[PDB]
Write a protein that holds these residues in place. Structure first.
Motif, mmCIF file in Angstrom:
data_model
loop_
_atom_site.group_PDB
_atom_site.id
_atom_site.type_symbol
_atom_site.label_atom_id
_atom_site.label_comp_id
_atom_site.label_asym_id
_atom_site.label_seq_id
_atom_site.Cartn_x
_atom_site.Cartn_y
_atom_site.Cartn_z
ATOM 1 N N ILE A 276 -1.689 35.251 -73.453
ATOM 2 C CA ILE A 276 -0.307 35.301 -73.811
ATOM 3 C C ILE A 276 0.095 34.172 -74.339
ATOM 4 C CG2 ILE A 276 1.661 35.074 -72.946
ATOM 5 C CD1 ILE A 276 0.975 37.594 -70.879
ATOM 6 N N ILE A 277 -0.609 32.759 -74.019
ATOM 7 C CA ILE A 277 0.023 31.503 -74.522
ATOM 8 C C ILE A 277 -0.323 30.851 -75.250
ATOM 9 C CG2 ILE A 277 -0.508 29.512 -74.110
ATOM 10 C CD1 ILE A 277 0.329 29.996 -70.624
ATOM 11 N N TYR A 278 -1.840 31.742 -75.354
ATOM 12 C CA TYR A 278 -2.711 30.985 -77.138
ATOM 13 C C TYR A 278 -2.673 32.516 -78.193
ATOM 14 C CZ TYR A 278 -4.880 28.463 -74.128
ATOM 15 O OH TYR A 278 -5.340 27.105 -73.078
ATOM 16 N N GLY A 279 -2.109 33.419 -77.621
ATOM 17 C CA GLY A 279 -1.974 34.834 -78.899
ATOM 18 C C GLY A 279 -0.514 34.247 -79.482
ATOM 19 N N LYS A 280 0.093 34.124 -78.602
ATOM 20 C CA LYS A 280 1.407 33.506 -78.643
ATOM 21 C C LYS A 280 1.714 32.202 -79.910
ATOM 22 C CE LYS A 280 5.081 35.631 -79.073
ATOM 23 N NZ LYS A 280 6.966 36.985 -78.863
ATOM 24 N N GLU A 281 0.892 31.610 -79.425
ATOM 25 C CA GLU A 281 0.233 29.991 -80.317
ATOM 26 C C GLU A 281 0.179 30.347 -81.558
ATOM 27 O OE1 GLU A 281 -0.692 27.144 -81.583
ATOM 28 O OE2 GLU A 281 1.357 25.914 -80.782
ATOM 29 N N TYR A 282 -1.234 30.800 -81.598
ATOM 30 C CA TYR A 282 -1.549 30.708 -83.196
ATOM 31 C C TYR A 282 -0.713 31.475 -83.886
ATOM 32 C CZ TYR A 282 -5.432 28.054 -80.752
ATOM 33 O OH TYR A 282 -5.985 26.889 -80.065
ATOM 34 N N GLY A 283 -0.955 33.009 -82.868
ATOM 35 C CA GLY A 283 0.057 34.282 -84.123
ATOM 36 C C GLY A 283 -1.164 35.038 -83.980
ATOM 37 N N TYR A 284 -1.743 34.809 -83.191
ATOM 38 C CA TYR A 284 -3.206 35.971 -82.564
ATOM 39 C C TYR A 284 -1.809 37.313 -81.770
ATOM 40 C CZ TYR A 284 -7.086 34.451 -83.984
ATOM 41 O OH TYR A 284 -9.246 34.875 -84.801
ATOM 42 N N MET A 285 -1.270 38.164 -82.211
ATOM 43 C CA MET A 285 -0.298 39.283 -81.418
ATOM 44 C C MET A 285 -1.340 40.277 -81.391
ATOM 45 S SD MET A 285 2.916 38.656 -82.207
ATOM 46 C CE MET A 285 3.993 38.552 -83.820
ATOM 47 N N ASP A 286 -3.034 40.212 -81.535
ATOM 48 C CA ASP A 286 -3.645 41.073 -80.728
ATOM 49 C C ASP A 286 -3.943 41.031 -79.554
ATOM 50 O OD1 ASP A 286 -4.824 39.307 -82.406
ATOM 51 O OD2 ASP A 286 -6.757 40.294 -82.622
ATOM 52 N N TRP A 287 -3.622 39.443 -79.318
ATOM 53 C CA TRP A 287 -4.341 39.127 -78.445
ATOM 54 C C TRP A 287 -3.362 38.577 -77.287
ATOM 55 C CZ3 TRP A 287 -8.854 35.100 -78.790
ATOM 56 C CH2 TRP A 287 -10.092 35.871 -79.996
ATOM 57 N N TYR A 288 -2.037 38.528 -77.634
ATOM 58 C CA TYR A 288 -0.519 38.641 -77.192
ATOM 59 C C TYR A 288 -0.758 39.766 -75.846
ATOM 60 C CZ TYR A 288 4.078 37.731 -76.407
ATOM 61 O OH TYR A 288 5.383 37.884 -75.963
ATOM 62 N N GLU A 289 -0.995 40.918 -76.734
ATOM 63 C CA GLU A 289 -0.392 42.051 -76.423
ATOM 64 C C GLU A 289 -1.587 42.471 -75.848
ATOM 65 O OE1 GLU A 289 2.390 44.180 -77.310
ATOM 66 O OE2 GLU A 289 3.086 42.885 -78.623
ATOM 67 N N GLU A 290 -2.761 41.764 -76.023
ATOM 68 C CA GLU A 290 -3.668 42.442 -74.900
ATOM 69 C C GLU A 290 -3.946 41.358 -73.449
ATOM 70 O OE1 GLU A 290 -7.861 41.666 -76.415
ATOM 71 O OE2 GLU A 290 -8.269 41.768 -73.688
ATOM 72 N N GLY A 291 -2.941 40.419 -73.942
ATOM 73 C CA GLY A 291 -2.664 40.071 -72.394
ATOM 74 C C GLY A 291 -1.582 40.134 -72.263
ATOM 75 N N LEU A 292 -0.352 41.172 -72.673
ATOM 76 C CA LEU A 292 0.472 41.789 -72.777
ATOM 77 C C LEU A 292 0.664 43.120 -71.612
ATOM 78 C CD1 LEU A 292 3.331 41.968 -71.396
ATOM 79 C CD2 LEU A 292 3.774 42.387 -74.149
ATOM 80 N N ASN A 293 -0.711 43.259 -71.730
ATOM 81 C CA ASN A 293 -0.724 45.252 -71.243
ATOM 82 C C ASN A 293 -2.280 44.559 -69.887
ATOM 83 O OD1 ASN A 293 -0.024 46.665 -72.604
ATOM 84 N ND2 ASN A 293 -1.850 46.227 -74.738
#
Ligand code: A1I7W
Length: 297
Positions: A276-293
């Motif tokens: 979530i943190i790094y997902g939303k850091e770089y811009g990696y919205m495919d891991w932001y949502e996998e973290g979120l999920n």
């Protein structure tokens, strides 16, 4: 994220090295911090993709010079460095290429059993030595405080998940950061120099000799809990798994394996928050949502 052409890489090196002539260049690999380039077949240059990578390159460079010639396996020698530029602490760095191929799980389990036990002795001895390196001379800069890291993450996650979950689901996250902070098994260790990304892709292997012949990628190297260097090996499938790591733990003479398992367990769950943190850091919205999920469970 920033990008480089081969010509940008060439002229960036020639600015700081006007006599060094490049004959061949190709891309060796790319990760999350740097792109690697192989130049004149014997050097690996990392160029950072962002200010965070640059600082991890700065620190890697610092750590390799400092531990040069003190470990029982080969490691990269720093032969070229760049300099600060705008928001990068280290514009690039060039290391000798250590020869060999990753010691993949498949490659390791396809090895005669004696070469497997060998490789596990060579890893414990390497870690035994890395972890007994005297650290008095390192700036406190480089000493990871796990307490602070957790509180830093907690605030970022509290900020981020306030837009993504309601009361009940948020309590589960609240509970998880409270439990971790209040359990001293995560903070009461003997800090030492750790590689901090110690996994099958950074362990090079020599199929002609059938023994480990190199450790690479120290960009995350820092002072911290030595157990971290075993946890990073233990994930099955993706890494070596329990039985093989257990042999390393016993050549190393670890006196508390259950606590290694207990920090792997915690680090496994925690991984959702890093994404979530790094997902939303770089811009990696495919891991932001996998973290979120995963967190909604
Ligand atoms: O992490 C960069 C790096 C430095 N020396 C190496 N040797 C072989 C493969 C990669 C590298």
């Amino acid at each position: 994220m920033r990008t480089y052409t081969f010509d940008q890489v060439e002229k960036a090196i020639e600015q700081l090295y006007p006599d060094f002539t490049i004959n061949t260049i190709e891309i060796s690999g790319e990760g999350n911090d740097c792109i690697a380039y192989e130049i004149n077949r014997d050097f690996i240059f990392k160029f950072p993709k962002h200010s965070r990578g640059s600082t991890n390159l700065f620190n890697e460079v610092n750590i390799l010079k400092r531990i040069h010639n003190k470990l029982p396996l080969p490691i990269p020698e720093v032969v070229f460095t760049g300099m600060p530029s705008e928001t990068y602490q280290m514009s690039f760095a060039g290391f000798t290429k250590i020869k060999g191929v990753p010691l993949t799980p498949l490659l390791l389990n396809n090895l005669p059993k004696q070469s497997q036990n060998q490789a596990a002795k060579d890893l414990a001895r390497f870690l035994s030595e890395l972890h007994s390196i005297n650290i008095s001379g390192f700036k406190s800069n480089l000493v990871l405080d796990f307490r602070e890291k957790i509180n830093e993450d907690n605030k970022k996650i509290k900020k981020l998940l306030s837009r993504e979950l309601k009361g009940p689901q948020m309590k589960k996250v609240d509970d998880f950061y409270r439990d971790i902070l209040e359990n001293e098994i995560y903070f009461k260790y003997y800090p030492c120099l750790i590689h901090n990304d110690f996994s099958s892709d950074h362990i090079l292997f020599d199929t002609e000799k059938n023994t480990i012949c190199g450790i690479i990628d120290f960009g995350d190297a820092a002072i911290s809990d030595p157990d971290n260097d075993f946890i990073s090996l233990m994930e099955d499938d993706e890494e070596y798994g329990m039985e093989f790591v257990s042999k390393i733990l016993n050549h190393y003479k670890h006196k508390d394996i259950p606590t290694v398992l207990e920090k792997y367990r915690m680090k496994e769950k925690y991984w959702s928050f890093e994404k979530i943190i790094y997902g939303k850091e770089y811009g990696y919205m495919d891991w932001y949502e996998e973290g979120l999920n995963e967190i909604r469970s």
